[PDB]
Amino acid sequence: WEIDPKDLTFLKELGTGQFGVVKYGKWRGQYDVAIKMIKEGSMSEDEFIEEAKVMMNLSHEKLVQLYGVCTKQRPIFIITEYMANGCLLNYLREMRHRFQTQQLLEMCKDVCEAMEYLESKQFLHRDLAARNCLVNDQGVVKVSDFGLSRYVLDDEYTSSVGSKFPVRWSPPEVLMYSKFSSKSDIWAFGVLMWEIYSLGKMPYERFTNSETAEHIAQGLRLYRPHLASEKVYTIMYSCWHEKADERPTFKILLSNILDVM
Numbered sequence: 441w442e443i444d445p446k447d448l449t450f451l452k453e454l455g456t457g458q459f460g461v462v463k464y465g466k467w468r469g470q471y472d473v474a475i476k477m478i479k480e481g482s483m484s485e486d487e488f489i490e491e492a493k494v495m496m497n498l499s500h501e502k503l504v505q506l507y508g509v510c511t512k513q514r515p516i517f518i519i520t521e522y523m524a525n526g527c528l529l530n531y532l533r534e535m536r537h538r539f540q541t542q543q544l545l546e547m548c549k550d551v552c553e554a555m556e557y558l559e560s561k562q563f564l565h566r567d568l569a570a571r572n573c574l575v576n577d578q579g580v581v582k583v584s585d586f587g588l589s590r591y592v593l594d595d596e597y598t599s600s601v602g603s604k605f606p607v608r609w610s611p612p613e614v615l616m617y618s619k620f621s622s623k624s625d626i627w628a629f630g631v632l633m634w635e636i637y638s639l640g641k642m643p644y645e646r647f648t649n650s651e652t653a654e655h656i657a658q659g660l661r662l663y664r665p666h667l668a669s670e671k672v673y674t675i676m677y678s679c680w681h682e683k684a685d686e687r688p689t690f691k692i693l694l695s696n697i698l699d700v701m
């Protein structure tokens with residue numbers, strides 16, 4: 441699990457996530473790393489350290505790899521695979537970068553691959569979204585910060601009405617009852633397809649977070665984004681059934697992305 445700070449060089453800043461300052465530099469002198477400095481009072485720190493064994497062990501070429509942790513200090517550091525294009529949500533909106541329908545389904549193919557893995561390792565993301573995917577040199581989309589939602593302290597993020605919460609990505613069984621399963625993950629997956637195809641547009645850009653939770657109750661679905669065929673769309677929409685038993689698996693969603701390639 442544990443990593444020696446002496447092996448960490450800091451070179452360039454990377455901005456700020458939910459758990460505060462994040463940097464770029466070198467592990468063991470050579471390798472390229474993303475370093476989260478976990479701001480004080482932001483993380484349920486104890487619970488993290490204990491359970492982080494199980495996150496270390498998750499390995500798929502489509503998940504941003506957890507290389508390991510520095511707990512023998514404060515601030516505590518998290519050490520992850522450096523993705524080079526940053527946030528997927530931003531790679532979508534760089535106004536000077538046009539895409540093709542196939543490039544987009546490819547990104548959905550990346551994301552579906554990683555969540556299939558998780559689904560078989562029975563492990564939940566809980567904050568799947570374009571903003572929490574990232575992109576490497578060869579433009580591959582990998583899934584970032586899976587399971588890490590569990591450990592935020594900030595009622596705006598934790599509490600289902602809170603300003604900072606993933607309303608727009610969450611099914612009703614979450615919005616009402618905070619009831620996460622593989623299927624609440626699936627719901628966010630389809631929302632993320634919509635994200636891809638709308639070139640990073642705010643879903644339900646019309647309504648507030650609160651107004652949304654209302655309308656989702658009432659059976660609002662996101663419409664087909666302009667760049668999506670009725671084929672792709674029959675895929676995302678399946679993500680959004682009312683009853684979570686009737687949402688597909690990630691294994692079915694992977695089959696169906698091939699079916700359409």
Ligand SMILES: Cc1c(NC(=O)c2ccc(C(C)(C)C)cc2)cccc1-c1nc(N)nc(Nc2ccc(C(=O)N3CCOCC3)cc2)n1
Nearest residue numbers: 454456457458462474521522523524525526567585588589
């Ligand atoms: C992951 C990441 C955060 N996020 C978080 O810290 C974070 C933590 C937890 C959550 C949950 C879901 C639990 C609430 C959410 C977010 C923030 C900043 C950089 C990074 C980051 N990580 C990794 N692994 N790689 C990069 N790469 C990168 C970042 C910025 C640039 C950049 O400045 N640019 C220049 C041009 O290219 C794009 C933007 C480039 C690469 N950035």
